[PDB]
Paper text:
Certain hydrolases preferentially catalyze acyl transfer over hydrolysis in an aqueous environment. Herein, we provide evidence that acyltransferase activity in esterases highly correlates with the hydrophobicity of the substrate‐binding pocket. Based on a detailed structure–function analysis of Est8 and several homologues, the present study aims to clarify molecular prerequisites for promiscuous acyltransferase activity, thereby enabling sequence‐based prediction of this remarkable phenomenon.
By screening several hydrolases using this assay, we identified a member of the family of bacterial hormone‐sensitive lipases (bHSLs), Est8, as a promiscuous acyltransferase. We observed that its substrate‐binding pocket consists of a well‐defined tunnel, which leads from the protein surface to the active site harboring a catalytic triad (Ser146, Glu240, His270). Remarkably, this tunnel is highly hydrophobic due to the presence of several methionine residues that are part of the N‐terminal cap domain, a helix‐turn‐helix motif covering the active site. As typical for bHSLs, the cap domain forms the most significant part of the substrate‐binding pocket of Est8. As discussed for CpLIP2, CAL‐A, and MsAcT, we assumed that active‐site hydrophobicity also plays a role for the acyltransferase activity of Est8. By using our hydrophobicity scoring, we were able to identify five bHSLs with much higher acyltransferase activity than Est8.
Numbering used by the authors:
A (entry chain AAA), B (entry chain BBB): 2 to 298
């Protein structure tokens, strides 16, 4: 609302500053994000670890979510950090709001497993879902920041490989440009308390392992969008990644894709994560909820 | 349990500044507290307005909560502000954690309705509960800050009037001493982001109506405690009101009252109010749940 928004902004502002303090050290960075993670929904949420075609994963089901309606969820963390643990609360709420069971992927991360390890797990995971006899028309592939990028990458890979595509793709504050050439990397630098050009390019370099920064599957800004299923893109105005969402939305419509873009005024990066006390976070999760139903009916 | 406590502390520090910038403007102050309050539990909580013996009130029942087991909840806000609206969330979490239906009072506030109106509403609300065939052994009277105070005053007044007493009383960071004479007004003044002596003595004066500050039903540190039911007192170590709790716990013990005092390290004033994201918030509420449950078996 705003004393709520201002809690969340100082929230990231502190996350943002412990980030800097970890330096290049990736164990530290991982701990900064894991320390912010709580799971207040745990008590009423069913969690079942599972191997998703060789990808460590977890079924996350809010009460009376359908077995046969499925979100394949791809967590953010710059392709170097995050885990089922950091995003578990958001996924549970998306499950509730959508009446769908989530498969939350623990996909391999950089520097240990650089690009395209993440993409191969996502695709492996999706192909596993089809193997379990879940209809493609009952699945949506959803993710935030890096994982929002990985949603586009994944759909592109799947379409290349000629695998039945899913009912839609949901991108929260997606990261699609590895070089940070977006206008918003300057016009939203003041407003954004955590994502900045330098730290993001550095995280990109780590993901790429010296491979080409314009590789479609790593930087889906530069990917071919023709034939992808409907895309839902939520992004905040107070985001250096605003123009990853604006440019992807423009390019996909031009390619004939059905896109819905929401630019949430004053909201910061993956504001969904502050859902428990930030009304906009839960509002944004309820909109995704409805989208998944109107797409999987 | 620290990136979260730091968000909470910043929360209070923002609130404390908005308090100071209303001056003594009571309309404005009442707006600061409404600003900060949300009700994320609303969707699963049954809320029923009611007149409680000529006191505007609300039944608030979490799922599972029983009709015949009740918390008379008495909200904080220094006897001048707060409402059912400010404390709805904390009250619904106390409802779920305790498996008890709660009655939230919009008790009358100074300076429109100075001391003793709050105490007359409280006791009027209590006797009404009894008129509705709710057994006193199935009642707990619970309150935070000013409302913590009001729990003590209410049990004193009820005992003096020979009204059959409830199973227990619960005081969260209770305000017992109108003159702020405790060691913690000096030893915890740096640590506590929200309660300072000056602002609080001056807020007592508003409640008192120039009546005596040692007045037992206004300052229950000075009340006789002999006869009162069991008390649960929870207070933060990072609180100027810490010694209100320790002093009240020592007097009460000495007067034969079965008293359970918990000092919570680093925690600030009514840290419960941050339960949605602050884990020690929800823990503190979970304990009150267990206390109410064991005291009403």
């Amino acid at each position: 609302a705003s004393p709520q928004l201002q809690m969340a902004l100082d929230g990231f502002k502190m996350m943002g500053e412990k980030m800097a303090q970890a330096g290049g050290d990736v164990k530290a960075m991982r701990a900064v994000m894991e320390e912010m993670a709580t799971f207040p929904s745990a008590g009423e949420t069913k969690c079942t670890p599972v191997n998703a075609g060789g990808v460590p994963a977890e079924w996350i089901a809010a009460p009376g979510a359908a077995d046969d309606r499925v979100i394949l969820y791809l967590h953010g963390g710059g392709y170097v950090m995050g885990s089922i643990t950091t995003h578990r609360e958001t996924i549970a709420r998306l499950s509730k709001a959508s009446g769908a069971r989530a498969l939350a992927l623990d996909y391999r991360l950089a520097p240990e497993y650089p690009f395209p390890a993440a993409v191969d797990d996502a695709t492996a995971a999706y192909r596993w879902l089809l193997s379990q006899d879940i209809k493609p028309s009952r699945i949506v592939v959803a993710g935030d920041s890096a994982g929002g990028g990985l949603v586009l990458a994944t759909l592109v890979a799947l379409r290349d490989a000629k695998v039945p595509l899913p009912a839609a793709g949901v991108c929260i504050s997606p990261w699609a440009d590895m070089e940070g050439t977006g206008a918003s990397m300057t016009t939203r630098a003041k407003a954004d308390p955590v994502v900045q050009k330098e730290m993001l390019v550095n995280m990109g370099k780590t993901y790429l392992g010296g491979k080409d920064a314009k590789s479609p599957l790593a930087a889906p800004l530069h990917a071919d969008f023709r034939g992808l299923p409907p895309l839902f893109i939520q992004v905040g105005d107070a985001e250096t990644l605003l123009d990853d969402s604006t440019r992807v939305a423009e390019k996909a419509k031009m390619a004939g894709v059905k896109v819905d873009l929401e630019i949430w005024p004053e909201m910061p990066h993956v504001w969904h994560l502050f859902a428990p006390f930030l009304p906009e976070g839960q509002q944004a999760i309820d909109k995704i909820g409805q989208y998944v139903k109107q797409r999987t009916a």
